[PDB]
Write a protein that binds this DNA or RNA. Structure first.
Ligand SMILES: [K+]
Ligand SMILES: [K+]
Ligand SMILES: [Mg+2]
Ligand SMILES: [Mg+2]
Ligand SMILES: [Mg+2]
Ligand SMILES: [Mg+2]
Ligand SMILES: [Mg+2]
Ligand SMILES: [Mg+2]
Ligand SMILES: [Mg+2]
Length: 117
RNA sequence: GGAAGGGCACCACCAGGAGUGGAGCCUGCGGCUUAAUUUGACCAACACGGGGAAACUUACCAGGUCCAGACAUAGUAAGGA
């Protein structure tokens, strides 16, 4: 249920628009201290990318979660075009995702907060 | 109709007034010139387009910006369009 909870929280944040995508924006948002959580994709070919993400998250004391596939993280971040037929096409991978505000409390928020802690 | 008859009009005349046409200047038109000298109009065009334009107006000419190219599909793309 942890993965489903994370997906639900990310989708609700996207609906509220309180989430950031990409490291170039992720570092800025995290340094603002407004980042309440960070999500990193495991499928990264740049060790410096993951090292910087982890170091910044640890330094700024921000909850960190990992995802196996970056394309799945991008899909959960809304970086796709939804077709009436079914799952959205034209997906683009998203290495990192950050959250500024959850908008409203949700069932998955509690599960995520319990897991990360 | 350089045919006849009847009638009528100061955008016709008669009887007259002011005149205009001549001079200087203002303003519109043609021509010429010009990078352009934007252009319509030739009784019923020509101080007309309410048109007396320094910029704007502006339509012309010599140059420099910008998209204020919705929407759909495809491509690129958060390792950033
Ligand atoms: K005279
Ligand atoms: K006139
Ligand atoms: Mg006369
Ligand atoms: Mg007379
Ligand atoms: Mg005279
Ligand atoms: Mg002229
Ligand atoms: Mg007449
Ligand atoms: Mg001009
Ligand atoms: Mg002018």
């Amino acid at each position: 249920d942890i993965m489903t909870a994370l997906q639900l929280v990310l989708k609700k944040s996207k609906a509220h628009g309180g989430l950031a995508r990409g490291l170039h924006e992720g570092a800025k948002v995290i340094e603002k201290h407004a980042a309440q959580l960070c999500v990193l994709a495991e499928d990264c070919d740049q060790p410096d990318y993951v090292k910087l993400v982890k170091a910044l998250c640890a330094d700024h004391n921000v909850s960190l979660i990992t995802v196996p596939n970056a394309k799945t993280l991008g899909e959960w971040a809304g970086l796709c075009k939804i077709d009436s037929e079914g799952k959205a096409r034209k997906v683009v991978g998203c290495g990192c995702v950050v959250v500024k505000d959850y908008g409203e409390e949700t069932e998955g928020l509690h599960i995520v907060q319990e897991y990360v802690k």
